[PDB]
Protein backbone atom coordinates (compact mmCIF):
# COMPACT_ATOMS: atom_id res chain seq x y z
CA UNK A 1 0.00 0.00 0.00
CA UNK A 2 1.39 3.33 -1.13
CA UNK A 3 0.34 6.95 -0.90
CA UNK A 4 1.10 9.85 -3.24
CA UNK A 5 3.63 12.59 -2.57
CA UNK A 6 4.24 15.23 -5.27
CA UNK A 7 4.05 14.39 -8.99
CA UNK A 8 6.21 16.84 -10.86
CA UNK A 9 6.28 17.17 -14.63
CA UNK A 10 8.89 16.25 -17.17
CA UNK A 11 7.23 17.76 -20.24
CA UNK A 12 5.86 21.31 -20.32
CA UNK A 13 3.60 22.95 -22.86
CA UNK A 14 2.64 26.62 -22.89
CA UNK A 15 -0.54 28.30 -24.09
CA UNK A 16 -1.32 31.86 -25.14
CA UNK A 17 1.01 34.73 -24.42
CA UNK A 18 -0.22 38.13 -23.29
CA UNK A 19 1.84 41.28 -22.86
CA UNK A 20 0.66 44.38 -20.94
CA UNK A 21 3.51 46.87 -21.33
CA UNK A 22 3.36 50.15 -19.41
CA UNK A 23 5.52 53.09 -20.43
CA UNK A 24 8.45 54.47 -18.38
CA UNK A 25 6.21 56.58 -16.20
CA UNK A 26 3.77 54.47 -14.03
CA UNK A 27 6.23 51.59 -13.90
CA UNK A 28 4.89 48.18 -13.10
CA UNK A 29 2.49 46.41 -15.42
CA UNK A 30 -0.31 44.05 -14.50
CA UNK A 31 -1.82 41.69 -17.08
CA UNK A 32 -5.02 40.43 -15.46
CA UNK A 33 -4.25 36.92 -16.67
CA UNK A 34 -1.69 37.02 -13.89
CA UNK A 35 -3.00 36.28 -10.39
CA UNK A 36 -3.85 32.75 -11.42
CA UNK A 37 -2.38 29.42 -10.63
CA UNK A 38 -1.99 28.71 -14.32
CA UNK A 39 -0.05 31.72 -15.64
CA UNK A 40 3.67 32.31 -15.10
CA UNK A 41 5.16 35.80 -15.27
CA UNK A 42 8.40 37.76 -14.98
CA UNK A 43 9.09 41.49 -15.24
CA UNK A 44 11.87 42.58 -17.59
CA UNK A 45 12.54 46.34 -17.79
CA UNK A 46 12.63 47.02 -21.49
CA UNK A 47 13.84 49.20 -24.29
CA UNK A 48 11.19 51.62 -25.56
CA UNK A 49 11.99 55.35 -25.67
CA UNK A 50 10.14 57.37 -28.35
CA UNK B 1 8.48 4.70 -5.51
CA UNK B 2 8.96 6.86 -8.60
CA UNK B 3 6.91 6.59 -11.77
CA UNK B 4 7.99 8.01 -15.10
CA UNK B 5 6.05 6.88 -18.13
CA UNK B 6 5.06 3.27 -17.43
CA UNK B 7 8.23 2.40 -15.52
CA UNK B 8 9.05 2.32 -11.83
CA UNK B 9 12.06 2.51 -9.58
CA UNK B 10 13.04 3.51 -6.05
CA UNK B 11 14.96 6.64 -5.07
CA UNK B 12 15.91 8.43 -1.82
CA UNK B 13 13.91 10.99 0.10
CA UNK B 14 16.82 13.30 -0.59
CA UNK B 15 16.96 12.95 -4.34
CA UNK B 16 13.22 13.02 -4.79
CA UNK B 17 12.64 16.27 -2.94
CA UNK B 18 15.55 17.99 -4.62
CA UNK B 19 14.63 17.62 -8.28
CA UNK B 20 13.97 21.12 -9.61
CA UNK B 21 10.73 20.71 -11.53
CA UNK B 22 7.10 21.82 -11.17
CA UNK B 23 5.45 20.51 -8.02
CA UNK B 24 2.07 18.93 -7.85
CA UNK B 25 2.16 19.10 -4.03
CA UNK B 26 0.64 15.63 -3.90
CA UNK B 27 -2.58 17.22 -5.12
CA UNK B 28 -5.50 15.29 -6.55
CA UNK B 29 -7.07 15.69 -9.97
CA UNK B 30 -8.80 19.02 -10.79
CA UNK B 31 -6.43 21.51 -12.37
CA UNK B 32 -3.40 21.00 -10.15
CA UNK B 33 -1.82 24.14 -8.83
CA UNK B 34 1.78 23.74 -9.91
CA UNK B 35 4.39 24.98 -7.52
CA UNK B 36 7.58 26.44 -8.93
CA UNK B 37 6.76 26.40 -12.71
CA UNK B 38 9.54 28.92 -13.22
CA UNK B 39 12.40 26.45 -13.45
CA UNK B 40 10.90 24.86 -16.52
CA UNK B 41 10.24 28.02 -18.57
CA UNK B 42 12.66 30.35 -20.36
CA UNK B 43 12.15 34.11 -20.13
CA UNK B 44 14.56 35.78 -22.54
CA UNK B 45 14.30 39.29 -23.98
CA UNK B 46 15.67 39.72 -27.49
CA UNK B 47 18.35 42.39 -27.37
CA UNK B 48 16.69 45.11 -25.25
CA UNK B 49 13.04 44.56 -26.35
CA UNK B 50 10.07 42.21 -27.06
CA UNK C 1 -1.22 64.45 -14.46
CA UNK C 2 0.35 62.08 -11.91
CA UNK C 3 0.16 58.24 -12.12
CA UNK C 4 -0.28 55.41 -9.61
CA UNK C 5 2.52 53.24 -8.26
CA UNK C 6 1.51 50.20 -6.20
CA UNK C 7 -0.84 50.66 -3.25
CA UNK C 8 -0.80 49.35 0.28
CA UNK C 9 -3.56 47.83 2.39
CA UNK C 10 -4.26 49.01 5.92
CA UNK C 11 -6.97 46.63 6.97
CA UNK C 12 -7.49 42.95 6.39
CA UNK C 13 -10.77 41.10 6.42
CA UNK C 14 -10.25 37.38 6.96
CA UNK C 15 -13.06 34.94 6.21
CA UNK C 16 -13.21 31.25 5.38
CA UNK C 17 -10.02 29.67 6.64
CA UNK C 18 -11.00 26.15 5.71
CA UNK C 19 -8.28 23.71 6.65
CA UNK C 20 -6.83 20.49 5.23
CA UNK C 21 -4.80 17.88 7.07
CA UNK C 22 -3.24 14.63 5.96
CA UNK C 23 -1.57 11.55 7.43
CA UNK C 24 2.02 11.43 8.74
CA UNK C 25 2.91 10.01 5.35
CA UNK C 26 0.43 10.66 2.67
CA UNK C 27 2.53 13.64 1.78
CA UNK C 28 2.11 17.20 2.85
CA UNK C 29 -1.30 18.90 2.69
CA UNK C 30 -3.24 20.71 -0.02
CA UNK C 31 -6.69 21.95 -0.88
CA UNK C 32 -8.42 23.60 -3.80
CA UNK C 33 -8.23 27.09 -2.37
CA UNK C 34 -4.55 27.73 -3.00
CA UNK C 35 -4.94 28.01 -6.77
CA UNK C 36 -7.22 30.97 -6.06
CA UNK C 37 -4.21 33.24 -5.33
CA UNK C 38 -6.61 35.54 -3.55
CA UNK C 39 -6.12 33.40 -0.47
CA UNK C 40 -3.07 32.96 1.74
CA UNK C 41 -1.95 29.59 3.08
CA UNK C 42 0.96 28.44 5.17
CA UNK C 43 1.55 24.68 5.36
CA UNK C 44 3.03 24.05 8.77
CA UNK C 45 3.81 20.54 9.87
CA UNK C 46 2.24 20.25 13.27
CA UNK C 47 -0.26 17.66 14.49
CA UNK C 48 -0.34 14.21 16.04
CA UNK C 49 -1.13 10.56 15.37
CA UNK C 50 -4.01 8.35 16.48
Amino acid at each position, epitope marked *: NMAEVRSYCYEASISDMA*S*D*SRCP*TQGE*AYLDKQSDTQYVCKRTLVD*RGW | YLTMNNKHWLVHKEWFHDIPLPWHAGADTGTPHWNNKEALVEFKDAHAKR | *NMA*EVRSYCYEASISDMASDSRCPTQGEAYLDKQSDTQYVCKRTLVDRGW
Partner: antibody
Amino acid sequence: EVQLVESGAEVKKPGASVKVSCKASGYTFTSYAMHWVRQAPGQRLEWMGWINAGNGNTKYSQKFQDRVTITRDTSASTAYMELSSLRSEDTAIYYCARDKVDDYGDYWFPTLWYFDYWGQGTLVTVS
Amino acid sequence: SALTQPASVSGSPGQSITISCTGTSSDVGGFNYVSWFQQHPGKAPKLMLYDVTSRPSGVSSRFSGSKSGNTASLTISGLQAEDEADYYCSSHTSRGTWVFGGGTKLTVL
Protein backbone atom coordinates in the same frame (compact mmCIF):
# COMPACT_ATOMS: atom_id res chain seq x y z
CA GLU D 1 -1.35 53.63 -54.94
CA VAL D 2 -1.76 51.43 -51.88
CA GLN D 3 -4.69 49.16 -52.71
CA LEU D 4 -6.63 46.81 -50.46
CA VAL D 5 -9.45 44.68 -51.88
CA GLU D 6 -11.67 42.05 -50.31
CA SER D 7 -14.28 39.43 -51.17
CA GLY D 8 -17.93 40.43 -50.85
CA ALA D 9 -19.48 37.54 -48.94
CA GLU D 10 -23.11 36.59 -48.29
CA VAL D 11 -24.97 35.34 -45.16
CA LYS D 12 -23.77 31.69 -44.80
CA LYS D 13 -26.43 30.94 -42.14
CA PRO D 14 -26.12 31.05 -38.33
CA GLY D 15 -23.35 28.70 -37.29
CA ALA D 16 -21.57 28.85 -40.65
CA SER D 17 -18.00 30.03 -41.26
CA VAL D 18 -17.01 33.16 -43.19
CA LYS D 19 -13.69 33.36 -45.00
CA VAL D 20 -12.78 36.85 -46.17
CA SER D 21 -9.68 37.58 -48.23
CA CYS D 22 -7.46 40.65 -48.08
CA LYS D 23 -5.12 40.76 -51.07
CA ALA D 24 -2.78 43.73 -50.67
CA SER D 25 -1.93 45.79 -53.74
CA GLY D 26 0.12 48.84 -54.52
CA TYR D 27 2.78 48.48 -51.83
CA THR D 28 5.44 46.07 -50.69
CA PHE D 29 4.27 42.81 -49.29
CA THR D 30 6.86 41.72 -46.67
CA SER D 31 6.16 44.92 -44.69
CA TYR D 32 2.33 44.85 -44.83
CA ALA D 33 1.23 43.17 -41.53
CA MET D 34 -2.57 43.27 -41.26
CA HIS D 35 -5.62 43.91 -39.16
CA TRP D 36 -9.28 43.00 -39.11
CA VAL D 37 -11.75 45.52 -37.76
CA ARG D 38 -15.37 44.40 -37.71
CA GLN D 39 -18.18 46.91 -37.95
CA ALA D 40 -21.84 46.74 -38.76
CA PRO D 41 -23.88 49.99 -38.81
CA GLY D 42 -24.93 51.67 -35.52
CA GLN D 43 -22.57 50.60 -32.68
CA ARG D 44 -18.89 50.88 -31.78
CA LEU D 45 -16.08 49.39 -33.89
CA GLU D 46 -14.61 46.29 -32.31
CA TRP D 47 -11.06 45.38 -33.20
CA MET D 48 -10.73 41.65 -33.63
CA GLY D 49 -7.37 41.56 -35.36
CA TRP D 50 -4.08 39.76 -35.65
CA ILE D 51 -0.61 41.31 -35.82
CA ASN D 52 2.23 39.84 -37.93
CA ALA D 53 2.37 39.00 -41.62
CA GLY D 54 6.09 38.33 -41.89
CA ASN D 55 6.32 35.42 -39.50
CA GLY D 56 2.64 34.50 -39.65
CA ASN D 57 2.18 35.34 -35.99
CA THR D 58 -1.22 36.33 -34.59
CA LYS D 59 -2.81 38.13 -31.65
CA TYR D 60 -6.58 38.11 -31.20
CA SER D 61 -8.95 40.11 -29.07
CA GLN D 62 -10.04 38.36 -25.91
CA LYS D 63 -13.63 38.32 -27.13
CA PHE D 64 -12.71 36.41 -30.30
CA GLN D 65 -9.70 34.72 -28.67
CA ASP D 66 -10.59 31.38 -30.16
CA ARG D 67 -13.08 31.91 -32.94
CA VAL D 68 -11.17 33.35 -35.90
CA THR D 69 -8.01 31.79 -37.29
CA ILE D 70 -5.90 33.55 -39.91
CA THR D 71 -3.86 32.28 -42.85
CA ARG D 72 -1.30 34.42 -44.65
CA ASP D 73 -0.26 33.59 -48.20
CA THR D 74 2.63 35.61 -49.61
CA SER D 75 2.43 34.01 -53.04
CA ALA D 76 -0.98 35.64 -53.36
CA SER D 77 0.13 38.42 -50.95
CA THR D 78 -3.14 37.67 -49.21
CA ALA D 79 -4.33 37.34 -45.62
CA TYR D 80 -7.42 35.22 -44.98
CA MET D 81 -9.42 35.85 -41.82
CA GLU D 82 -11.91 33.08 -41.15
CA LEU D 83 -14.55 33.47 -38.43
CA SER D 84 -15.88 30.08 -37.38
CA SER D 85 -19.19 29.62 -35.55
CA LEU D 86 -20.63 33.00 -36.40
CA ARG D 87 -23.93 34.06 -34.85
CA SER D 88 -26.82 36.42 -35.53
CA GLU D 89 -25.00 39.37 -33.96
CA ASP D 90 -21.77 39.26 -35.94
CA THR D 91 -23.58 40.59 -39.01
CA ALA D 92 -20.97 43.21 -39.88
CA ILE D 93 -18.42 44.48 -42.40
CA TYR D 94 -14.81 43.38 -42.01
CA TYR D 95 -12.13 45.85 -43.07
CA CYS D 96 -8.50 44.82 -43.38
CA ALA D 97 -6.00 47.57 -42.63
CA ARG D 98 -2.23 47.87 -42.22
CA ASP D 99 0.20 49.08 -39.58
CA LYS D 100 3.71 48.53 -40.92
CA VAL D 101 5.99 46.18 -39.09
CA ASP D 102 9.25 47.36 -37.57
CA ASP D 103 12.04 46.18 -39.91
CA TYR D 104 13.33 43.42 -37.59
CA GLY D 105 10.24 41.73 -39.02
CA ASP D 106 8.98 41.20 -35.48
CA TYR D 107 5.89 43.25 -34.71
CA TRP D 108 5.54 44.24 -31.04
CA PHE D 109 5.15 47.99 -30.79
CA PRO D 110 3.37 49.53 -33.77
CA THR D 111 4.19 52.59 -35.80
CA LEU D 112 2.97 55.70 -34.07
CA TRP D 113 0.35 55.83 -36.81
CA TYR D 114 -1.65 52.67 -37.15
CA PHE D 115 -4.02 52.47 -40.06
CA ASP D 116 -2.97 54.55 -43.03
CA TYR D 117 -5.24 52.59 -45.36
CA TRP D 118 -8.25 50.31 -45.16
CA GLY D 119 -9.72 47.39 -46.99
CA GLN D 120 -12.79 48.64 -48.87
CA GLY D 121 -15.03 46.30 -46.84
CA THR D 122 -17.01 43.09 -46.98
CA LEU D 123 -20.47 43.18 -45.45
CA VAL D 124 -21.31 39.77 -43.97
CA THR D 125 -24.84 39.08 -42.74
CA VAL D 126 -26.23 36.20 -40.72
CA SER D 127 -29.66 34.60 -41.17
CA SER E 1 -13.34 47.88 -23.26
CA ALA E 2 -14.43 50.66 -25.61
CA LEU E 3 -13.13 54.14 -25.02
CA THR E 4 -15.66 56.72 -23.99
CA GLN E 5 -16.67 58.91 -26.89
CA PRO E 6 -19.82 61.05 -26.97
CA ALA E 7 -22.60 60.25 -29.43
CA SER E 8 -22.79 63.58 -31.55
CA VAL E 9 -22.24 67.53 -32.33
CA SER E 10 -23.00 70.80 -34.63
CA GLY E 11 -22.45 74.66 -35.26
CA SER E 12 -21.53 77.52 -37.54
CA PRO E 13 -18.85 77.16 -40.23
CA GLY E 14 -15.33 78.15 -39.19
CA GLN E 15 -16.30 77.51 -35.56
CA SER E 16 -14.10 75.29 -33.42
CA ILE E 17 -15.65 72.09 -32.10
CA THR E 18 -14.09 69.76 -29.54
CA ILE E 19 -14.49 65.97 -29.55
CA SER E 20 -13.49 64.44 -26.22
CA CYS E 21 -12.23 60.85 -26.09
CA THR E 22 -11.69 59.69 -22.51
CA GLY E 23 -9.77 56.50 -21.83
CA THR E 24 -8.03 54.99 -18.82
CA SER E 25 -4.44 54.86 -17.65
CA SER E 26 -4.17 51.47 -19.37
CA ASP E 27 -4.24 53.05 -22.82
CA VAL E 28 -4.79 56.72 -23.58
CA GLY E 29 -3.05 58.13 -20.52
CA GLY E 30 0.14 56.10 -20.35
CA PHE E 31 0.69 56.15 -24.11
CA ASN E 32 0.73 58.71 -26.87
CA TYR E 33 -1.11 56.18 -29.02
CA VAL E 34 -4.22 57.90 -30.34
CA SER E 35 -5.80 58.40 -33.74
CA TRP E 36 -9.11 59.82 -34.91
CA PHE E 37 -10.63 58.06 -37.90
CA GLN E 38 -12.82 60.08 -40.22
CA GLN E 39 -15.24 57.47 -41.53
CA HIS E 40 -17.41 58.60 -44.38
CA PRO E 41 -20.49 56.43 -43.86
CA GLY E 42 -20.77 53.73 -46.49
CA LYS E 43 -17.18 54.47 -47.51
CA ALA E 44 -13.97 53.21 -45.91
CA PRO E 45 -12.54 55.01 -42.88
CA LYS E 46 -9.42 57.15 -43.11
CA LEU E 47 -6.97 58.36 -40.49
CA MET E 48 -7.00 62.10 -39.78
CA LEU E 49 -4.29 62.51 -37.09
CA TYR E 50 -1.68 59.94 -36.00
CA ASP E 51 0.75 60.47 -33.14
CA VAL E 52 -1.74 62.91 -31.83
CA THR E 53 -0.58 66.42 -32.67
CA SER E 54 0.90 65.06 -35.92
CA ARG E 55 -1.08 64.54 -39.10
CA PRO E 56 -0.71 62.47 -42.28
CA SER E 57 0.39 64.40 -45.33
CA GLY E 58 -3.03 64.51 -46.98
CA VAL E 59 -4.78 65.92 -43.91
CA SER E 60 -6.57 69.22 -43.95
CA SER E 61 -4.29 71.23 -41.68
CA ARG E 62 -7.09 72.67 -39.57
CA PHE E 63 -7.51 69.42 -37.61
CA SER E 64 -5.69 69.56 -34.26
CA GLY E 65 -5.17 66.86 -31.65
CA SER E 66 -4.41 67.23 -27.94
CA LYS E 67 -4.12 65.10 -24.80
CA SER E 68 -3.79 65.63 -21.04
CA GLY E 69 -4.44 62.93 -18.48
CA ASN E 70 -6.91 60.55 -20.05
CA THR E 71 -8.26 62.60 -22.96
CA ALA E 72 -8.13 62.73 -26.71
CA SER E 73 -9.33 66.01 -28.19
CA LEU E 74 -9.91 66.48 -31.90
CA THR E 75 -10.29 70.24 -32.25
CA ILE E 76 -11.27 71.47 -35.70
CA SER E 77 -11.52 75.08 -36.75
CA GLY E 78 -13.45 76.78 -39.54
CA LEU E 79 -15.32 73.70 -40.31
CA GLN E 80 -15.75 73.44 -43.97
CA ALA E 81 -19.24 72.14 -44.85
CA GLU E 82 -18.18 68.64 -45.84
CA ASP E 83 -16.45 67.69 -42.66
CA GLU E 84 -19.05 65.23 -41.41
CA ALA E 85 -17.20 61.96 -41.14
CA ASP E 86 -18.16 59.81 -38.15
CA TYR E 87 -15.20 60.46 -35.93
CA TYR E 88 -13.92 57.41 -34.04
CA CYS E 89 -11.07 57.63 -31.53
CA SER E 90 -8.78 54.62 -31.35
CA SER E 91 -5.67 53.80 -29.36
CA HIS E 92 -3.23 51.02 -28.56
CA THR E 93 -3.89 49.61 -25.11
CA SER E 94 -1.13 48.37 -22.87
CA ARG E 95 -2.15 44.73 -23.32
CA GLY E 96 -1.29 44.92 -27.00
CA THR E 97 -4.78 45.31 -28.44
CA TRP E 98 -6.45 48.31 -30.04
CA VAL E 99 -9.81 49.74 -29.02
CA PHE E 100 -12.01 52.10 -31.02
CA GLY E 101 -14.06 54.68 -29.19
CA GLY E 102 -17.81 54.89 -29.28
CA GLY E 103 -17.46 57.26 -32.15
CA THR E 104 -18.83 60.75 -32.59
CA LYS E 105 -21.36 61.27 -35.33
CA LEU E 106 -20.59 64.82 -36.35
CA THR E 107 -23.47 67.19 -36.92
CA VAL E 108 -22.41 70.21 -39.15
CA LEU E 109 -24.97 73.04 -38.41
